[PDB]
Design a protein around this ligand. Structure first.
Ligand code: PUY
Ligand code: PUY
Lengths: 276, 276
DNA sequence: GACCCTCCCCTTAGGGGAGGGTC
DNA sequence: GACCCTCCCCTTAGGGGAGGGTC
C-alpha cells in the first residue's frame, strides 16, 4: 500500500522466480516500479502486481515473451481475438499430435507383426491385410545394384506426408523359375505408406497402390547374401510342390533390425507372393 | 556403391540440411564413413544412409538428439518399448492441450459476457448461470485496505490446478443500508475457478463454493473511486424501490480492462446480488 | 544471518554468414 | 564456378552459481 514489495516478497507472492522477474525487467516486459539508485535493489508496488496475471496465463499457454508485450496493450475486444489465435494454433498442434499418435500406433502394429513371425527361413502361407504403398519403376535395378539412394524420391514423398520414414524398403519382381540371381530384375521398388494425409504434388512416375488382402506364401529370415537366393528358391519349390497358383509379383521387404552404427548392419527380409 | 557421397549429395538425397549433418557428426550421432585427412571433407557410404531413417523419424516425433543415441542401440523388442514411451508422452501433451483449449474457450466465454454488458452504471436484473469459485475469509478487509497480495493464496491454488490466472478478483459482503464505505467489511474474498482438475492439497481455510444459478440485480461500470459507493447505493435503492427480496451477499468482481503498463490502470467492476 | 545485487557460464538444434581452400 | 571446409555470432527463458555489498 504505502511501501514497496522487494523482489523476494513478490516472487513468494506471485509464484514467479526471482531470476524470472529480473529477466522480465531486463527485456522491459515487467519492470520494478522503483529502483533504488544506489543499491540497484528492485522495488514493486502492490497495484502493478496485476500485470502478472496476463504474463503468467500467457506463459502457461506458451505464448513467447516478445509476443506478450504486443498482447499487454490490447483492450478486451482486441485481446479476445488474440485468444482465438492461440486457440487455432492449439487445434493445429492437437491435429498434428492425434495424427502422430495414430502413426506411431501403426508403426508399432507393423513392428509386432515382425517379432511375431511364425518362424524364420521356413515357408508359411498366411492370410494378410493389405498394405498401401507407393512405388516407381525399378528402371533396370535388381538385387545386385539397388542402393538406398534409389529410394530417395519415394521416401521424399512419404516424408512430406507422413513425417515418419518407411522403416522398410520393398521391391517386387516376376515369379519365374529363376536359376540365378544374376537373372533377376525388379519390376518396381516401393515403400509402404502410413498416413492418409493426401500426398502433395505427387508425380506421374509414382504409382500409389497396395499389396492387396489375400493369401500369401511368405518366407522371412535375417539377411545374409548366401541365403537370399536360396530362400527364394525355397518359395519357388513350395509353390511347385503344392501345384499352387500364384497371382502377383513376388513382393520383398527389407527391415533393419537396428540402426546403431556401433553394431554390425543387420536386416530382416521377407518375401511373399499372393496365391489363389 | 564403390565411391562416396559428399555431404551435399547426401543432403539432397536425405532431405536433411548440410549444417544438420555437420552437427550430427559433431555430436557423434551420425558421422561421415570417411573423412579426407587433408581437406576435412566428409564422405558417406550408401549403406550408412539407413541410420537416417531413425534419426529423421525420431526428430519428427521430437525426441531430443542425446536420447536418439540411446535409441539407435535397441533391437526391435526394446525399441518397441521406446515407442510406447513416446506414445504416452504424447497422450500426456494432448490431455494437457485439450484441457488448455477447453480453458481458453471458457475464458473467452466470460470475456464475451463482459463486452456484451447491457449497459454501464445502470442496474439490470438478469438470469445468471452459476460461477464456481474458491474463497477465504476476508479477515477484516474491506474495499479500503484490500490489496492484490490479499489474493496471493487463492491465486496460488487456482494456478496449480488451472494454470490460468483468474482474470477477476471477487469479494462479497452483507447487503445493508450502507451510508458510508467507511462502514463496510468483506465477508469473503474469492476467485472464480475454471477447470475441474481436482485441486491438490486444498486447505481448510479455503472454501469451494459457487455463485449459484438465479436472478440477480447487477450493476457494472468502469471503476473510479467516486462511483464505487454511489453505484452501490443505486443498487440498494433499486431493491428498495421494487420491494425486492435479496437472498445472498452482494458479490463484486473486478476485471482489468487491459494489462499494459504504458496505459492508465483501468478496471471493470460489477456488483450483483441474488433475488427471489 | 538473510537478501539482494551484477555478471560470468550453460543448455537445444542448428542457420547465417564470413573468409578461406577445393572440385 | 561450385562446393565444401572451420569458426565466428545468434536465437528462448531463464537456472546455477560466484563474489560481492545490503538488510
Ligand atoms: C540394406 O539396405 C538396402 C539396400 C537396398 C535395398 C533395395 C532392395 N529392397 C533389396 O533387395 N535389398 C537387399 C539386397 O537385395 C541387397 N544386396 C546387397 N548385396 C547383395 C548380394 N550380394 C552381395 C552377393 N546378393 C543379393 N542381394 C544383395 O541389399 C539389401 C540388403 O542390404 C533395400 C535395403
Ligand atoms: C485493482 O486491483 C484490485 C485491488 C483489490 C481488489 C480487491 C477487491 N475485489 C476490491 O474491492 N477492489 C477494488 C476497490 O474496492 C479498491 N479501491 C482502491 N481505492 C479505493 C477507494 N478510494 C481510493 C477512495 N474507494 C473504494 N475502493 C477502492 O481497489 C480495487 C480496484 O483497484 C481487487 C482488485
Amino acid at each position: 500500500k504505502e511501501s514497496y514489495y522487494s523482489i523476494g516478497e513478490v516472487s513468494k507472492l506471485a509464484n514467479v522466480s526471482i531470476k524470472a522477474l529480473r529477466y522480465y525487467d531486463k527485456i522491459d516486459l515487467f519492470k520494478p516500479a522503483y529502483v533504488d539508485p544506489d543499491t540497484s535493489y528492485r522495488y514493486y508496488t502492490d497495484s502493478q502486481l496485476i500485470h502478472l496475471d496476463l504474463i503468467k496465463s500467457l506463459k502457461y499457454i506458451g505464448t513467447p515473451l516478445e509476443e506478450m508485450k504486443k498482447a499487454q496493450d490490447l483492450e478486451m475486444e482486441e485481446l479476445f481475438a488474440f485468444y482465438t489465435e492461440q486457440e487455432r494454433q492449439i487445434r493445429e498442434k492437437l491435429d498434428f499430435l492425434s495424427a502422430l499418435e495414430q502413426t506411431i500406433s501403426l508403426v508399432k502394429k507393423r513392428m509386432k507383426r515382425q517379432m511375431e513371425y511364425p518362424a524364420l527361413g521356413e515357408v508359411f502361407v498366411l492370410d494378410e491385410e493389405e498394405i498401401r504403398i507407393i512405388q516407381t519403376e525399378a528402371e533396370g535395378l535388381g538385387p545386385e545394384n539397388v542402393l538406398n539412394a534409389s529410394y530417395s524420391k519415394l521416401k521424399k514423398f512419404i516424408e512430406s506426408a507422413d513425417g515418419f520414414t518407411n522403416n522398410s524398403y520393398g521391391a517386387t519382381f516376376s515369379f519365374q523359375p529363376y536359376t540365378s540371381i544374376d537373372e533377376m530384375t525388379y519390376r518396381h521398388i516401393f515403400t509402404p505408406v502410413l498416413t492418409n494425409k493426401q500426398i502433395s504434388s505427387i508425380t506421374p512416375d509414382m504409382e500409389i497402390t497396395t499389396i492387396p488382402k489375400g493369401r500369401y506364401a511368405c518366407i522371412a529370415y535375417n539377411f545374409s547374401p548366401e541365403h537370399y537366393f536360396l530362400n527364394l528358391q525355397k518359395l519357388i519349390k513350395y509353390i511347385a510342390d503344392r501345384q499352387l497358383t500364384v497371382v502377383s509379383d513376388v513382393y520383398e521387404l527389407i527391415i533393419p533390425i537396428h540402426y546403431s552404427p556401433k553394431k554390425q548392419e543387420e536386416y530382416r527380409v521377407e518375401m511373399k507372393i499372393r496365391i489363389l
